[PDB]
Design a protein around this ligand. Structure first.
Ligand SMILES: *[C@@H]1O[C@H](CO)[C@@H](O[C@@H]2O[C@H](CO)[C@@H](O[C@@H]3O[C@H](CO)[C@@H](O)[C@H](O[C@H]4O[C@H](CO)[C@@H](O)[C@H](O)[C@@H]4O[C@H]4O[C@H](CO)[C@@H](O)[C@H](O)[C@@H]4O[C@H]4O[C@H](CO)[C@@H](O)[C@H](O)[C@@H]4O)[C@@H]3O)[C@H](O)[C@H]2NC(C)=O)[C@H](O)[C@H]1NC(C)=O
Ligand SMILES: *[C@@H]1O[C@H](CO)[C@@H](O[C@@H]2O[C@H](CO)[C@@H](O[C@@H]3O[C@H](CO[C@H]4O[C@H](CO)[C@@H](O)[C@H](O)[C@@H]4O)[C@@H](O)[C@H](O[C@H]4O[C@H](CO)[C@@H](O)[C@H](O)[C@@H]4O[C@H]4O[C@H](CO)[C@@H](O)[C@H](O)[C@@H]4O)[C@@H]3O)[C@H](O)[C@H]2NC(C)=O)[C@H](O)[C@H]1NC(C)=O
Ligand SMILES: *[C@@H]1O[C@H](CO)[C@@H](O[C@@H]2O[C@H](CO)[C@@H](O[C@@H]3O[C@H](CO[C@H]4O[C@H](CO)[C@@H](O)[C@H](O)[C@@H]4O)[C@@H](O)[C@H](O[C@H]4O[C@H](CO)[C@@H](O)[C@H](O)[C@@H]4O)[C@@H]3O)[C@H](O)[C@H]2NC(C)=O)[C@H](O)[C@H]1NC(C)=O
Ligand SMILES: *[C@@H]1O[C@H](CO)[C@@H](O[C@@H]2O[C@H](CO)[C@@H](O[C@@H]3O[C@H](CO[C@H]4O[C@H](CO)[C@@H](O)[C@H](O)[C@@H]4O)[C@@H](O)[C@H](O[C@H]4O[C@H](CO)[C@@H](O)[C@H](O)[C@@H]4O)[C@@H]3O)[C@H](O)[C@H]2NC(C)=O)[C@H](O)[C@H]1NC(C)=O
Lengths: 361, 361
């Protein structure tokens, strides 16, 4: 839907979490496709080493494709998995650090002192407010959620997935009120029972260090205004910088991958040069063929017709349907168990049946 | 080697990071061992489908063990990876949050106001200290490093890998000094030029909410001591609680795994019942054998002597040394390329050579 550059700590937290979740989903995806290919290759290997000579030859070209696809997926999972294990940690820490920053900017309250016993005096009942940073744990409410500034875009469209230059500061306020009128305490002490002195601290996600501004607020008797001090915290920013760099590394690695989706459709095998090269090797008069196609395309189509029907129309009937009829065995204590290759998914059992078949000859 | 229960935010931050790294390194080792077994199995498959009749039979039992080892390592990698995908992010978040808590507890400084122009008056030169929470980014210094409270023990010996209870509080200090003597401001205002009012905030990792204690410090004229307010922040603690649960779930899954190290030593194959069962299947007169040993142990030993020398003493010479001499080919553009099975490590090339071999018969 809408994915826009994050502005607030809460927005950047969700965005960095979404990024990490995206990369993990792509990785899970490549691993599932890898498993699908090796599952196919094992079944084809049982077919390619069986005693059905017609099925034996028909299994070899699809086996070459399944093995290439498997290996490629495996290499791609390794590449993506390597990027993930070197960078996703920095994303997890970034989301947490941004979330804690959001906590800090929402803290409020103050401390207030009222004069007691005399002008400018402080006694046992002088603390009239003390809720500074009393907080209840809540989840950060996303700001402008309709604008989707919390949503992540894996393509980095318009280069928008950038982090703000955070620089957390403590903004300290001091407000002296002489009481009675609205004036400060420049010319009068805090009046007994009415004079007030208020302290607060707010954390801001971005700011600049700066000394107190009492020169413009307490230099004369006038309406009371808080004097502000801004001190650089130098927390959280560096974790968010590292996270930005890491998300950029991950984005580039994960923006593309060549792992192919496992399939039994003939049209997906004909797409493969390994398939066609092996068909010529297995069925033509040149067992040493290295070409992906024949000089006359009709020659290849003839080899395909005899093996899988014209234009591969009998691909399922001649290959997968015959593989389903096989009954290789695995050990089962003192006896054996016949595998049903149409539904068997345990590579341990398939590997065992293949070994037992090769030892049966 | 020395690992103890963590006590400070900095210690617990390092312990949680060590945990995450340990689990990732164990998962990486499982993936390495899986890759070693499938590499071995592919080479044994080339031997088991080659034209050397003696090598063909000698490869099958080791192939059965290799495929079982690979499938078991794949299952354990899946078990460990599922646990890691569900929990390591919480460890990463815990380490960062504890590190940020370490930052917060190190923040010091204060705001100081000095009376100017008269007793209890505040003018443009009244802010005489303003360094509250000025901080430069530094790495947290591990406290009591010789105790090893920052080190993680993956065995959880004596149940020590427990996180402390965290409950961060803001402890606010307010100190009034009348000036002249050491007394507070109960009976006198801040004296001109000498009376001071000091305000500070410290974050503590553990604490309890408590209202101001002016009733015991500002109730009479006496030596000045700061009045304290303690307010509960309800930040960070929940992340650490969730990280502790996550670490316990990961510990249980990662404390053991059955993925075997790939090996070419006969002594590692003789440990496998699959290996011995397949030997009897391939070399005895019972092609349908399902027992892992013969009734007379000497019978199995005679089968081993025939294939791999007495007690496997010729295992390398009859198996691996023979695989090193095979020269199966892969496609190399318009021609071919012979693989050296002793050094080849690309599963794409080995799979292709296997498929070409099977299509060559
Ligand atoms: C405030 O919060 C911020 C975060 O918001 C904190 O910044 C973070 O600080 C982390 C350390 O406190 C830092 O992580 C460290 O980064 C360095 C450099 O990348 C890295 O070397 C560290 O890795 C060690 O520690 C982890 C566990 O924490 C181990 O898994 C790892 O193997 C390393 O262990 C080695 O060093 C440790 C000491 O740091 C030893 O305890 C440990 O035994 C081991 O020692 C051997 O190797 C040493 C190095 O070769 C060697 O000297 C020694 O003799 C041994 O042979 C670790 O990952 C974060 O990167 C950082 N975050 C950012 C974004 O900056 C900050 O600390 C907080 N500050 C305050 C004041 O509270
Ligand atoms: C102060 O700082 C604290 C941390 O120190 C922070 O607390 C954390 O809040 C965030 C949200 O702000 C929490 O993350 C969310 O958690 C909920 C609940 O998940 C829990 O349980 C599930 C299982 O059901 C676990 O998997 C999970 O680990 C938690 O234990 C999740 O439902 C949220 O999911 C969204 O996460 C990503 C976006 O960030 C997406 O990848 C994911 O698909 C989810 O998105 C969905 O919901 C979004 C809105 O929530 C929506 O925009 C999407 O479109 C989509 O529908 C999320 O993971 C985190 O657990 C809290 N940590 C702790 C320890 O409590 C406070 O928020 C902050 N407080 C302030 C500033 O007030
Ligand atoms: C989508 O595409 C955009 C466009 O490329 C990407 O935006 C870039 O994102 C990266 C990482 O977030 C940014 O890199 C960071 O830049 C910071 C600013 O650098 C400027 O200013 C410094 C001085 O302040 C100069 O020295 C420097 O030359 C620049 O002029 C740096 O401060 C960062 O480095 C610091 O932190 C890292 C992290 O620990 C340290 O390793 C460094 O040593 C250093 O301390 C960092 O390099 C980059 O600036 C962004 N480009 C633009 C144009 O803004 C998005 O990241 C991308 N999104 C995704 C998801 O891919
Ligand atoms: C090494 O072995 C030790 C001993 O088994 C393990 O210690 C356990 O660690 C777990 C996980 O950290 C602890 O579980 C957590 O306990 C918190 C407090 O529990 C105690 O105090 C409460 C008082 O409120 C008592 O009722 C209770 O009996 C305990 O004595 C809970 O607050 C946690 O639950 C909360 O947070 C989680 C996280 O989000 C939520 O899911 C929950 O709903 C809840 O809000 C949590 O249950 C456990 O207490 C420890 N056991 C003991 C006996 O100390 C180590 O974890 C282990 N180390 C490793 C690395 O494996």
């Amino acid at each position: 839907t809408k994915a826009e550059a994050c502005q607030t700590p809460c927005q950047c937290s969700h965005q960095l979490r979404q990024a990490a979740a995206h990369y993990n989903s792509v990785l899970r995806e490549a691993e599932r496709k890898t498993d699908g290919h090796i599952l196919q290759a094992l079944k084809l290997l049982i077919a390619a080493t069986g005693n059905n000579q017609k099925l034996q030859a028909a299994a070899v070209a699809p086996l070459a494709t399944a093995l290439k696809n498997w290996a490629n997926c495996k290499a791609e999972t390794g590449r993506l998995g390597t990027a993930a294990r070197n960078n996703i940690d920095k994303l997890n820490a970034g989301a947490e650090a941004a979330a804690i920053l959001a906590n800090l900017t929402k803290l409020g309250g103050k401390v207030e002192l009222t004069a007691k016993g005399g002008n400018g005096q402080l006694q046992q009942d002088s603390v009239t407010a003390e809720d500074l940073w009393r907080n209840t744990a809540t989840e950060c409410q996303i700001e402008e959620a309709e604008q989707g500034r919390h949503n992540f875009d894996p393509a980095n469209s318009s280069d928008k997935m950038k982090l703000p230059k955070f620089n957390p500061v403590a903004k300290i306020g001091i407000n002296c009120k002489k009481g009675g009128d609205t004036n400060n305490c420049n010319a009068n002490a805090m009046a007994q029972n009415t004079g007030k002195l208020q302290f607060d601290v707010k954390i801001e996600a971005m700011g600049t260090q700066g000394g107190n501004d009492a020169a413009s607020k307490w230099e004369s008797a006038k309406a009371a205004e808080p004097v502000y001090i801004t001190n650089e915290l130098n927390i959280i920013a560096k974790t968010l910088e590292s996270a930005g760099v890491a998300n950029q590394a991950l984005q580039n690695e994960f923006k593309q991958n060549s792992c192919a989706e496992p399939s039994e459709e003939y049209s997906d095998f004909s797409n493969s040069g390994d398939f066609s090269r092996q068909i010529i090797r297995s069925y033509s008069n040149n067992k040493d063929n290295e070409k992906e196609t024949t000089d006359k395309p009709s020659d290849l189509e003839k080899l395909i017709e005899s093996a899988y029907g014209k234009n591969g129309a009998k691909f399922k009937e001649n290959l997968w349907d015959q593989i389903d009829k096989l009954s290789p065995t695995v050990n089962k204590g003192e006896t054996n168990e016949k595998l049903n290759l149409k539904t068997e998914k345990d590579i341990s059992k398939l590997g065992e049946a293949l070994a037992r078949q090769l030892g049966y000859i």
